[PDB]
């Protein structure tokens, strides 16, 4: 009940970070200034976009079992429904964060 | 029919969401710039909570459907868009109310 | 299936493409208030960008079979949506070219 609405809100944080994240990954891409530097940053913006959609993954994984105990509850059905858009978000960023990454390469 | 034209309205109400949820995220990190202007940001929010309502109303209009029809796999995926494009709303609405603080 | 996810991977590739092409078409507009920009250039970002439109519609139609074919599988529904997020980019990206192009004539 008040733990789906609580796991959606999660999901929808971690979606916002995502989006966040494709953005930095983005202007990174715009900006290919070349060199150590900007591999290195490119890098971590790898790393936190992978990190952010293994987190998402759990939280899918949370709300299907939520989702499984609730028997269907439109609360756990839109907690889950959150949790894959934030995956779906965080993969995005990854996908840019690469693309920047090895164009600063 | 009207089970398939519900689908098609909830599917355009989530699609008109993920705009306004990123119209509302430019406005926020803008906001963080100083130069947000907090009648955009209300427009932003009105137009999210426009979405969320319509959305809740969709969701009745499926609900009442979906018993008519006695559990209909059609019946069901109209409901099911409209729960997705609520959700999408609600998530809309959130990002323009954060636009709407920051800016003020 | 794998059709859904390569549908995926290329609207998310065209979204992050017309937000670059967007980026272009903004500067190129700035810079037409400074009375430097080309026309030229306004006129082959205007181009660019309506390519990415047009790719935008046709995975959309794509994305629509296949999300008819696969009966609202997670996957297909993911491919739509990305579609649906590069058709929207591919159009703030043109809208922004003619801006830029029409200040530059």
């Known amino acids: 009940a008040e733990?789906?609405?609580?796991?959606?809100?999660?999901?929808?944080?971690?979606?916002?970070?995502?989006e966040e994240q494709r953005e930095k990954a983005k202007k990174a891409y715009e900006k290919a200034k070349k060199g150590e530097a900007s591999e290195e940053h490119a890098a971590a913006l790898l790393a936190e976009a992978a990190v952010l959609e293994l987190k998402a993954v759990l939280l899918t994984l949370e709300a299907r079992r939520l989702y499984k105990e609730l028997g269907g509850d439109e609360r756990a059905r839109e907690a889950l429904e959150a949790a894959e858009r934030a995956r779906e978000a965080a993969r995005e960023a990854r996908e840019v964060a690469e693309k920047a990454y090895d164009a600063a390469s």
């Open 3 to 18: 733990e789906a609405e609580r796991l959606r809100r999660e999901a929808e944080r971690n979606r916002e970070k995502a």
